[PDB]
Design a binder for this molecule. Structure first.
Ligand SMILES: Nc1nc2c(ncn2[C@@H]2O[C@H](COP(=O)(O)OP(=O)(O)OP(=O)(O)O)[C@@H](O)[C@H]2O)c(=O)[nH]1
Ligand SMILES: Nc1nc2c(ncn2[C@@H]2O[C@H](COP(=O)(O)OP(=O)(O)O)[C@@H](O)[C@H]2O)c(=O)[nH]1
Ligand SMILES: [Mg+2]
Lengths: 626, 62, 427, 426, 62, 85, 184
């Protein structure tokens, strides 16, 4: 019951528009993880307390100008109103929860005097609702447009606001406390039919800048809402303009949809001796970024340069310094993580500071001690499943969704061999035997295959098809004879190397997910969606004892210590259980992985526990006695 | 070799100003005044190349 | 002993895409083209540490061809084997036989020329084409004509895909099938029918896949071809060659249309289920629920039959099995042939393809027979052919290409004459 | 290798084409500036069909824009995916025809078509092996129908051996915008039956009906109607641009669907079409696609197919599918509704499978039916034409420009014998 | 020259020792241009080539 | 057949003779990246840029689909006699 | 290259109607220009090479200078337009003695020289379009006792409008020539 101390945390969401946001004062960065926002000390990488409270993924963020109040919204199941939560950054408490938007809250924004909030929500809802922050009340609401709208922003005097469509319109909404209504005036685009993504208001509200999807910045003069010269004269940007921030000077830093940064001069100028203004000439074409830019935030105020924190859809936080004296951008990425959900992780035998975490299209070799990612190899568009080292450090085996098993080298990531058909579909479990000559594979078909890897060829030996469900896990014994396969049938099979046969089959009402040998092959520990951990006698097969731990949702991760005194358990919920082996007892930790945890392990030297959830996060814990 | 030369005047000018989007050179409109009334004829000569470079002090010295 | 195999059309190249996968799997050839004497009938070893197949894939669209060029077997085929035109025949026999054929066929046969020249003990040709399509029928018939005027004497095993009665993916395939058969008659020596309804039922019934793609069809067709060519590839207790089908199965110079079958088509669980012996698989190879052409041979009488065996098979039980069958009366032979069977045994069992659904069986049978059920099939196609020609439908596409109605009428009366010959021989 | 040249005429053609090139560029993964930014390599191999490669790794569309007023050209360059067109492709008049078929075929054609022919001919020789021409236009407008029709006649006079598609909307009395709709449609139909290879007739009443019932949208703006027609046109050429298990060329579709050189007027459909509110309660299976496909309320014409017979039909599927399911489903729909097909043509359903679905979905299809219920539409127009031409109403703006009365009488004759021969085959 | 393919030669592949199908007739052939070629090909030991060379020489001389 | 395909074939014959290449594209180099690991293990002051090295392989040509469902719930459909395929 | 091709009666190396006509040719333009325009007398797109100095601007047939195309066809046929300017074209050929001769046909010389590596020939043209046929084998047999084996490269110089340059095996006449190789 006692909470487990949480060491380092690696992972953040970049897919969210304008998600990465900085604190107005001092050292604090904050980004949304799966369904909980995470504070971090800007100075040193020491994780800060998380803010729980969301039922599902957070999909927007907003911070007051003073930095006292913070607002966030979530995306929910279709048909259930999503709620905005307002936190206090002095006392980290859920202060107000308000649910009006049907499906998802598209974006939020604070007033300059922090008196009001604005929430626009729903790819289908399309309703703008103004809230007051003093109490969880909503002032007035209005259906915005026919086509959907993306982002809103308040002015810097804050009677008014401006909103833009996804598709084809843009309005400025003024608020008067006489009717308690919102009066819109739509912009006068001469003939342009652009698709807007992001908008930012100036430091003095004279213009606004909206990034179209066509790839150009559009400057809109305010008050008459009349459009003004367009963005980069030297062609557009390679994708839709997706990120925009305003330099404290008369400049705007725009991040295109394909990892491109540009500083744009905003002061107008007539050229060719004409009444016509020329296009905004870019004062500096910043260096490129690998990921699609989604979030830009101005971090620091320094007279010799300005630093910005830039998030990417590839989930790579960059710091960029802009020196206005000599026009150049220097970029250093400080953190990276997974973009999509991850599944499966691996440990090298009797080695500590290496991780093999593989999500969609990527294998990643992490260094545990510092969390600095070392090596990432990508197959373009494919889904990775069960990853596993070989007992000898050479091969890193990885299954894939197309049904091919591929083995890579840990250094240089050079693929050594591939099986152009391991299964008819995705393979879900792969295991290396101690002598590294045999390899066990299991796909969704439910067939367990064994492959003998020859020094230049790889051949298939007998393949058994006991299961009718997708094989969920495969575990081999110290000697090469024994391997157990856990599938969604509700059965676990024990096999025999010397004769490709089965001895017995463990049976449960619910599908078996994870299965682990006890050290020294005395017993088996199985966990499934029956919410019930089960001990089994390794030799003849029998239900020793059924523990009802974590009855509320399914349990899919079992890890066991090297001696076998403790047993780490993942769950369908967000908490990590730490049981003693001989007795059903708890030492668990609750607050982590806003999304369900999918795999967990303990380092061979018994110092740390490592967990990976259905959101792109890896949580290094501190191991202790049970 | 065009059968009718003026057949392109409208479309070609409209294309450069709008289709291609290139900046249209819009000069030599000084003194034209309004329509309905005579443009004051300037004494300038169109053909003459009155560059007459003056690098008074920008000339380097031998 | 070497045989070369050409593939013509969209179907032919995909069947070959499965055949050559199975071949390199049997002789242990990695897809890059090297091993880590039995192969010599298919793969010539040129230079050093390299095996190239004896085949040409040809088609007029580049789509499926450069799919092979960029698929798994890039390094395997020599890039000049894969002929590709510019535009389809598009279900038009005359377009495939006169317009584009005249430019592509010379390149094709002057490529197979140096194929046969590199060969030394050429056994024969075997072609793969679907007559429902445009190229596989049109320029397939053009190529067969020019191959017969070149060699003539040699056996040409044709594994052709016919349209099924009710399951169909084209509309003019009656026209294409009849015009192809008008040349399939007097050019090929041995022509094996392979329909699609029958194979769908097989993979639904025995292999119990409910959603089968063309991949599964092509896989077990590759099994049939390998099962009837393993006699040349490996040494058996009783091996029979490709020139034997020419002799033992074709009693008359025009009656060469063979119903094929294969057993045991068994899933992975039914392998542990059933006790695999020789008597029952020789029985299973005779029921219409295991044949590759959708027809009922009970209505017909057999003319000749050939049984290839693979695996651990002694000749005693096959003697007993065919004894019981010849004593059975559920199937009847013709009076013109008392000895209607031809056995053949090979030692090696059939292999499994990782990614297939067939389990490792110790023994297998491949039956290639002759009957008058085919005489029923040709009447079924001819009936629906005259239905369309009664209204002169679709004729303008052919005439617009340059052909006329003369070859329509003469192909029609040709199938009529063939029908008369089938009903005359069956008596 | 096989090349499609796209021609857009009139305001409707230009706005449809704007959405069509939008969807195509989205499928092949090129940005609205003209650079490839996809990830898979299936999209590189088959952009030569639609985009002449240009310096800078820019793929510009192979389309010829054709109209008479600068208003539509501004609306073309305005919207997104507007900066990708080559500016010299904008073949272009100055005044506008405005619902006058004579002004689209005798007055302005004689001085605009030399120019548009030179760009089309020059664009044809820009690619190696032509597959066919593909025009999108209307039959009611003036600058679209008249100008496009004389273009069709000149092209078929030049390149008689290449296929020809015409995506043509037709007037309906319920959605009747202009007034001389029969005067423009009849003369265009009389010319399309003698020059076009096959015609994919569209109509706005059926599209609005579809958006009311199946989509359940509140306000169907023109952006949505053109989006559906855009999905149909992308469905008809998915096979040339993507490998599949049964590839169907355009000429392969023509020979399977045209039994007689004049019986080439199709009706088109598209699936899956469901609201957001029902996107979650539905599955993605071939029967679900097929039940929606053969539904009479999913045709994009104002012609009930149950009021006539199907001569031939074709279906183009996209997505990882099982061909056995495809064939047996077409087998079931052919055996259950046996009375609605014609008898003297066996196997009236040609089908095809492609291995790439359109973006945003898991699986899709496209129905193209050469039925004989389309003669209802042509009767519905010809009866209006006769109503006016007994009076000679509106006739003088036509006969005063060079056209004679014999054109109208012959057009009536050709429309009448055409619907008579559809009725004969019914 | 055989690689280039200008030789009117093919193999019959008969049951006996295969013979040479001569595309053109042998009598009207130019011997000044071909005899040296075939006689130079006798040095070959590769299976597809030496057979053709020797049989062509034999047939021409006969 | 045509000039286009002929030059394609020439290029591909050359490309097939060459031994297969393990990497489609290589970022940085193994040696440069290896040194960064050495200075990291030796001490501090190593930018994240140097340690993180990425490699890209061929992978599948296809775009990405959600996995196809071959079989539905066994209660809905059975073969002729019965059973769950 | 071109050594594993078929090399039938006709072989086209450059044709002015295609997605990339100069796909194998390596252009060398200096004080000149290259275009694909439409000629007003045949209503077709021709490739135009025009430069001040004839010796500077040209287009060689195989792009990589070390790589050499090998073609065994006797006759070389060019379809060009005479612009009353200076124009030349050159071909390398291989003899039976494994030596490389060059044949340069030029518009602006009168003499006919025979040199160990180069045979320079005069060439006169008509006014409009014209197809020229070269007969490589006979020119080799005349300028040297040797005979023809292979053509290694071909290169055309400035001031000409070219389209469909191609090899052949016979002196084809018009009626027996196919359509796409004919003039009109
Ligand atoms: N057995 C089998 N038959 C196929 C396969 N693919 C296509 N077919 C058959 O081929 C017939 C039509 O001809 P296709 O092969 O598709 O095309 P084609 O023969 O090249 O003729 P064109 O399309 O005009 O070029 C159809 O009846 C299909 O049944 C396949 O993968 N396996
Ligand atoms: N679907 C669709 N139909 C249109 C559009 N614009 C016009 N139309 C239809 O086109 C018909 C008349 O065409 P018209 O505008 O006169 O063509 P044009 O004047 O020759 O360019 C009317 O019935 C309109 O309903 C459009 O953007 N989408
Ligand atoms: Mg085909």
């Amino acid at each position: 019951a006692e909470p487990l101390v949480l060491n380092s945390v690696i992972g953040f969401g970049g897919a969210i528009e304008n998600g990465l946001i900085a604190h107005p004062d001092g050292r604090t960065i904050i980004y949304p993880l799966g369904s909980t926002i995470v504070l971090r000390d800007r100075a040193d990488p020491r994780s800060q307390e998380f803010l729980q409270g969301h039922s599902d993924k957070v999909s927007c963020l907003a911070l007051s100008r003073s930095g006292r109040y913070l607002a966030s919204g979530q995306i929910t199941y279709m048909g259930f109103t999503a709620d905005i939560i307002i936190w206090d950054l002095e006392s980290k408490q859920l202060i107000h929860r308000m649910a009006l938007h049907k499906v998802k809250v598209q974006a939020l924004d604070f007033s300059c005097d922090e008196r009001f909030l604005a929430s626009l929500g729903g790819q289908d809802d399309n309703a703008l609702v103004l809230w007051d922050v003093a109490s969880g009340n909503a002032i007035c609401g209005s259906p915005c447009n026919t086509n959907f709208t993306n982002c809103v922003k308040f002015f810097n005097n804050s009677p008014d606001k401006l909103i833009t469509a996804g598709n084809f319109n843009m309005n400025v909404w003024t608020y008067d406390a006489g009717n308690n209504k919102l009066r819109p005036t739509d912009a006068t685009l001469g003939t342009l039919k652009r698709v807007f993504k992001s908008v930012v208001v100036d430091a003095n509200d004279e213009y606004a800048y909206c990034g179209t999807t066509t790839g150009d910045v559009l400057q809109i003069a305010l008050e008459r809402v009349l459009f003004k010269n367009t963005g980069p004269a030297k062609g557009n940007v390679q994708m839709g303009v997706t990120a925009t921030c305003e330099v404290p000077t008369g400049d705007i830093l725009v991040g295109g949809g394909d990892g491109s940064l540009q500083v744009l001069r905003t002061v107008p100028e007539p050229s060719s001796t004409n009444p016509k203004l020329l296009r905004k000439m870019p004062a500096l074409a910043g260096t490129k970024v690998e990921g699609a830019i989604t979030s830009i935030a101005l971090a620091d105020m320094n007279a010799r340069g300005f630093t910005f924190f830039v998030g990417t859809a590839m989930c790579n936080i960059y710091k960029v310094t802009y020196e206005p004296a000599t026009s150049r951008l220097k970029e250093e990425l400080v953190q990276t993580a997974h973009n999509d959900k991850i599944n499966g992780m691996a440990f090298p035998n009797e080695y500590s500071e290496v991780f093999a975490t593989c999500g969609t299209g990527f294998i990643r070799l992490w260094h545990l001690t510092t969390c600095r990612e070392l090596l990432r190899i990508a197959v373009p568009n494919l889904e990775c499943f069960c990853i596993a080292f070989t007992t000898d450090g050479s091969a890193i085996l990885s299954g894939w969704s197309d049904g091919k098993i591929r083995a890579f080298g840990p250094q240089s990531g050079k693929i050594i061999f591939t099986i152009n058909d391991a299964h008819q579909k995705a393979v879900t479990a792969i295991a290396s035997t101690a002598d590294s000559s045999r390899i066990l594979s299991g796909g969704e078909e439910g067939m367990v295959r064994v492959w003998r890897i020859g020094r230049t060829s790889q051949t298939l030996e007998a393949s058994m098809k006991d299961h009718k469900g997708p094989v969920n896990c495969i575990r081999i014994k110290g000697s090469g004879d024994e391997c157990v396969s856990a599938s969604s049938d509700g059965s676990c099979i024990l096999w025999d190397l010397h004769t490709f046969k089965r001895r017995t089959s463990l049976f449960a009402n619910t599908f078996f997910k994870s299965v682990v040998y006890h050290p020294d092959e005395s017993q088996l520990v199985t966990a499934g969606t029956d919410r019930k951990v089960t001990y089994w006698d390794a030799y003849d097969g029998n239900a020793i004892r059924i523990i009802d731990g974590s009855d509320l949702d399914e349990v899919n991760a079992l890890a066991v210590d090297r001696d076998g005194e403790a047993l780490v358990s993942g769950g369908g919920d967000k908490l990590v259980k730490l049981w003693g082996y001989d007795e059903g007892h708890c030492y668990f930790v609750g607050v982590a992985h806003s999304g369900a945890i999918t795999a967990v392990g303990v380092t061979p030297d018994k110092q740390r526990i490592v967990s990976v959830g259905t959101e792109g996060g890896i949580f290094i814990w501190d191991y202790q006695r049970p | 070799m065009n059968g009718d030369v003026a057949g392109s005047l409208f479309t070609s000018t409209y294309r450069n100003v709008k289709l291609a989007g290139k900046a249209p050179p819009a000069a030599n409109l000084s003194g034209t005044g309004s329509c309905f009334d005579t443009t004051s004829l300037s004494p300038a000569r169109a053909g003459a190349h009155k560059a007459l470079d003056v690098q008074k002090d920008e000339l380097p010295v031998w | 002993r070497e045989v070369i195999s050409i593939h013509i059309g969209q179907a032919g190249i995909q069947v070959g895409n499965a055949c050559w996968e199975l071949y390199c799997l049997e002789h242990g050839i990695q897809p890059d083209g090297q091993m880590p004497d039995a192969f010599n009938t298919f793969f010539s070893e040129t230079g050093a540490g390299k095996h190239v197949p004896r085949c040409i894939f040809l088609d007029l669209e580049p789509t499926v061809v450069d799919e092979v060029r960029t698929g798994t077997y890039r390094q395997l085929f020599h890039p000049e084997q894969l002929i590709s035109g510019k535009e389809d025949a598009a279900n038009n026999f005359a377009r495939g036989h006169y317009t584009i054929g005249k430019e592509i066929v010379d390149l094709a046969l002057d490529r197979i020329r140096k194929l046969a020249d590199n060969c030394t003990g050429l056994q024969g040709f075997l072609v793969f084409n679907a007559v429902g399509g445009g190229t596989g029928s049109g320029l397939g018939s053009l190529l067969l004509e020019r191959l017969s005027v070149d060699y003539g004497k040699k056996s040409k095993l044709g594994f052709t895909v016919y349209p099924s009665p009710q399951v169909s993916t084209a509309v003019v395939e009656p026209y294409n099938s009849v015009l192809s058969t008008h040349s399939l008659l007097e050019h090929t020596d041995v022509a094996v029918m392979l329909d699609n309804e029958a194979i769908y039922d097989i993979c639904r019934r025995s292999l119990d896949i409910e959603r089968p793609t063309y991949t599964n069809l092509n896989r077990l067709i590759a099994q049939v071809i390998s099962s009837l060519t393993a006699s040349l590839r490996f040494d058996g207790a009783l091996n029979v060659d490709i020139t034997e089908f020419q002799t033992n199965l074709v009693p008359y110079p025009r009656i060469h249309f063979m119903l094929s079958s294969y057993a045991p088509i068994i899933s992975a669980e039914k392998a542990y289920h059933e006790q695999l012996s020789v008597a029952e698989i020789t029985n299973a190879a005779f029921e219409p629920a295991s044949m590759m052409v959708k027809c009922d041979p009970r209505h017909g009488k057999y003319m000749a039959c050939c049984l290839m065996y693979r695996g651990d098979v002694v000749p005693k039980d096959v003697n007993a099995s065919v004894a019981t069958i010849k004593t059975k009366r559920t199937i009847q032979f013709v009076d013109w042939c008392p000895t209607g069977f031809k056995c053949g045994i090979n030692y090696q069992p059939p292999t499994v393809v990782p990614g297939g659904d067939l389990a490792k069986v110790q023994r297998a049978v491949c039956m290639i027979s002759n009957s008058t059920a085919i005489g029923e099939i040709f009447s079924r196609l001819d009936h629906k052919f005259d239905l369309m020609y009664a209204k002169r439908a679709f004729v303008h596409w052919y005439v617009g290409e340059g052909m006329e109605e003369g070859e329509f009428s003469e192909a029609r009366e040709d199938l009529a004459a063939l029908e008369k010959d089938f009903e005359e021989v069956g008596a | 290798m096989r090349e499609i040249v796209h021609i857009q005429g009139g305001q409707c053609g230009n706005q449809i084409g704007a959405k069509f090139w939008e969807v195509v560029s989205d499928e092949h993964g090129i940005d609205p500036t003209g650079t490839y930014h996809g990830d898979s390599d299936l999209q590189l191999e088959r952009i030569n069909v639609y985009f002449n490669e240009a310096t800078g790794g820019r793929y510009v569309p192979r389309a010829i824009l054709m109209d008479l007023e600068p208003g539509t050209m501004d609306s073309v360059r305005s919207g997104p995916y507007g900066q990708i067109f080559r500016p010299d492709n904008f073949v272009f008049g100055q005044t506008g025809a405005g619902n006058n078929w004579a002004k689209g075929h005798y007055t302005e054609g004689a001085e605009l078509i030399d120019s548009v022919l030179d760009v089309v001919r020059k664009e044809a020789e820009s690619c190696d092996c032509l597959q066919g021409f593909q025009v999108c236009h209307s039959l009611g407008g003036g600058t679209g129908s008249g100008m496009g029709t004389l273009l069709i006649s000149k092209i078929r006079e030049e390149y008689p051996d290449r296929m020809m598609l015409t995506f043509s909307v037709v007037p309906s009395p319920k959605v009747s915008d202009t007034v001389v709709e029969p005067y423009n449609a009849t003369l265009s139909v009389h010319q399309l039956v003698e020059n076009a290879d096959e015609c994919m007739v569209l109509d706005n009443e059926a599209l609005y009906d579809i958006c009311f019932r199946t989509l359940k949208l509140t306000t169907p703006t023109f952006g949505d109607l053109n989006h559906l027609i855009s999905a149909v046109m992308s469905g008809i050429t998915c096979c040339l641009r993507f490998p599949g298990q049964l590839n169907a060329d355009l000429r392969k579709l023509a020979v399977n669907l045209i039994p007689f050189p004049r019986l080439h007027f199709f009706m088109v459909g598209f699936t899956p079409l469901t609201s957001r509110g029902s996107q979650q309660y539905r599955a993605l299976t071939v029967p679900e696609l097929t039940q929606q496909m053969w539904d009479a309320k999913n045709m994009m014409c104002a012609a009930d197919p149950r009021h006539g017979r199907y001569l031939t039909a074709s279906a183009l599927f996209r997505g990882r599918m099982s061909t056995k399911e495809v064939d047996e489903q077409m087998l079931n729909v052919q055996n259950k509704n046996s009375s609605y097909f014609v008898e003297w043509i066996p196997n009236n359903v040609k089908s095809s499978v492609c291995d790439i679905p359109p973006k945003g979905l898991k699986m899709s299809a496209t129905f193209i039916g050469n039925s004989t219920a389309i003669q209802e539409m042509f009767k519905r127009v010809s009866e209006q034409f006769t109503a006016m031409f007994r009076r000679k109403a509106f006739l003088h703006w036509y006969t005063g420009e060079g056209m004679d009365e014999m054109e109208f009488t012959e057009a009536e004759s050709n429309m009448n014998d055409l619907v008579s021969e559809y009725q004969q085959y019914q | 020259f055989y690689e280039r393919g200008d030789l009117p030669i093919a193999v019959d592949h008969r049951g006996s020792k295969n013979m040479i199908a001569w595309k053109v007739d042998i009598e009207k052939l130019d011997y000044h241009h071909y005899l040296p070629i075939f006689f130079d090909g006798i040095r070959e030991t590769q299976e597809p080539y030496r057979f053709l060379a020797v049989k062509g020489v034999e047939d021409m001389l006969r | 057949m045509d000039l286009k395909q002929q030059v394609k074939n020439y290029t591909m014959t050359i490309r097939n003779t060459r031994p297969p290449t393990m990497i489609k594209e290589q970022d940085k180099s193994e040696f440069s990246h290896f040194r960064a690991l050495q200075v990291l293990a030796n001490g501090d002051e190593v930018p994240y840029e140097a340690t993180l090295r990425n490699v890209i392989h061929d992978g599948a040509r296809q775009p990405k689909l959600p996995p196809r469902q071959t079989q539905k719930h066994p209660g809905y459909i059975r073969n002729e006699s019965g059973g769950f395929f | 290259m071109f050594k594993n091709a078929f090399q039938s009666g006709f072989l086209s190396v450059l044709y002015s109607i295609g997605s990339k006509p100069l796909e194998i040719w390596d252009k060398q333009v200096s004080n000149g220009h290259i275009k694909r325009i439409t000629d007003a007398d045949i209503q077709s797109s021709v490739l135009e090479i025009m430069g001040q100095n004839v010796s500077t601007t040209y287009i060689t047939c195989p792009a990589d200078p070390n790589k050499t195309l090998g073609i065994k066809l006797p006759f070389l046929v060019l379809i060009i337009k005479n612009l009353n300017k200076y124009f030349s074209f050159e071909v390398q050929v291989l003899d039976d003695k494994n030596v490389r001769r060059r044949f340069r046909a030029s518009n602006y010389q009168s003499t006919t020289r025979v040199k160990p590596f180069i045979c320079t020939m005069p060439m006169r043209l008509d006014s409009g379009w014209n197809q020229i046929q070269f007969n490589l084998s006979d020119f080799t047999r005349r300028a040297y006792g040797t005979n023809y084996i292979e053509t290694l490269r071909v290169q055309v110089h400035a001031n000409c409008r070219i389209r469909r340059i191609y090899f052949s095996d016979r002196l084809y006449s018009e009626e027996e020539l196919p359509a796409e190789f004919k003039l009109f």
